[PDB]
Amino acid sequence: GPSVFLFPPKPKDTLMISRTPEVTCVVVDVSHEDPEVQFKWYVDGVEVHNAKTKPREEQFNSTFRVVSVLTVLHQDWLNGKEYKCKVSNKALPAPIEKTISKTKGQPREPQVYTLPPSREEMTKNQVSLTCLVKGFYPSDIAVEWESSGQPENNYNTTPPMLDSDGSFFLYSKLTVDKSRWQQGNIFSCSVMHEALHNRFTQKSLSLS
Amino acid sequence: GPSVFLFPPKPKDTLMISRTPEVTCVVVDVSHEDPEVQFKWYVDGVEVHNAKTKPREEQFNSTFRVVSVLTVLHQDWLNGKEYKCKVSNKALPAPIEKTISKTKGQPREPQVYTLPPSREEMTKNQVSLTCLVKGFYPSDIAVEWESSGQPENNYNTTPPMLDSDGSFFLYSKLTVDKSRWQQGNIFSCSVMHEALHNRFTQKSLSL
Amino acid sequence: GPSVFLFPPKPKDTLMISRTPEVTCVVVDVSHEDPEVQFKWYVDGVEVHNAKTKPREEQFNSTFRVVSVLTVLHQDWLNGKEYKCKVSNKALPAPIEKTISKTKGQPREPQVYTLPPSREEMTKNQVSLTCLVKGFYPSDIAVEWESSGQPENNYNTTPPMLDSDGSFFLYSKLTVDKSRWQQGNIFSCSVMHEALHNRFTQKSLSLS
């Protein structure tokens, strides 16, 4: 029978009110004999009607994929409210229900560090700048290499590896041509996260 | 039916002078009705028998996994010699051949960069010294913080991501108490790689 | 009857992978009645077939000299693996076997010191600079007077003479006309050795 997957909204969408966060319920392996899929949506057990079902799409295995989206309230998502998707399809023995909420775990304020390039790296054409974002939880975050609060041309961001502190860390590799760094630009790495003051922080960088 | 995968030697095997690299040919999904798998190995198309076929292994899907390995020489691997694995099995429609050599693409001498800790990082008890390794190609790499050209060890290593220069980069997160950085330790970092002098170069850092 | 000599590869060839190190088996005093010499080669007792026999050459004593060369692996030579040459000739009562490996003895990191010329030597046309390479063992080494890592015009290298520390030392006499030194050029003695990090170290020198 078909299977159902439920995706969270983008972190920024949950943190920026001028944005709309939504959860996405994806149903795969729906059969052609019974392609109709009913979606019912609930926020912490209360049915809401601002959810919408996306068009059904046939998959490589000759089954249908059916998706429903529920708009979620900023307050509901950031406070960790639970959003339930109910999926019904005749190729299912029982309706499938899936719940999602703000990515599980206690929020942690990201510690944003901007590691300068190696002194020996000035002999090379292009130097790397290194936004260490550590001590942040959940992975719902935005990490924002910048100059003086204005995002940068080129950063090659590592995965959220776990740091020496049990948080996620990543490096955003703000890789900059030698003149940019050597001249002492005030780069900055900003980071957007629920646990930050402003849900948004800015930690600068310059030849130092 | 069966599938064959041919793996290069471990990067440090190809890159550490003291090591002997070998290539490993893995065959999965060999059937039980015809479990016999023939491995023939070739170096630059010439069949060799210093290659060895590993034991057949039953997968949970009621198939067999069969593996053969061929030792490769430092200069041979680094000079791009081609090592070919020929796999035959009756559950295959035809024999499957795979060849492996130094990972194809322009080699680049790794630029080894003990990046200093962030000024912003001095607020914490511990700071990260990052041995950026950039400008290297292939990903066939080994990375190694150091001090005075001798190793350091609380380095994380990121993946060989792509760098802006069209190479791989990775960051080697040595992470250390703030005092070590502020005290002006002569750290270093080595990187072992085919394009390097002695395939191994070391770059130092200190405050 | 004939005699056999086995020579090691050049140190640099063993330390630079982009180089190929080889061992050379030399057979002298081979007779003219039986000039044919068979060479068999083994690496740590395992016969290899990437060895080659050089052309036979008649010596001053009216005997033949026959030579065989075996390419050696970087790993094999630097790890001290043993390479055996088997020599057969009818003018021999029994085959002659000779083994060679990385020059015998415990590796020691070369200490590279660049001694400036005498203060009184500026009164003379041309001053000497003194690359003291000490604490290095074995003699498999490359010693490299330079400027800033780029080899120099004129160093009169003094022998591997044993030092106060039981290593070989040598000077390399980077003799330089007075203006080069007096102006404070960053000369440099580098030194390549198995015991060095990178098998290769670089030391500056300047008027100091």
From TrEMBL, chains A, C:
Subcellular localization(s) per the UniProt record: Cell membrane
Domain Ig-like: 2-101, 110-206
Domain of life of the native organism: Eukaryota
Disulfide bonds: C25-C85, C131-C189
Name of this protein: FLJ00385 protein
Organism: Homo sapiens
Species classification: Eukaryota, Metazoa, Chordata, Craniata, Vertebrata
Gene: FLJ00385
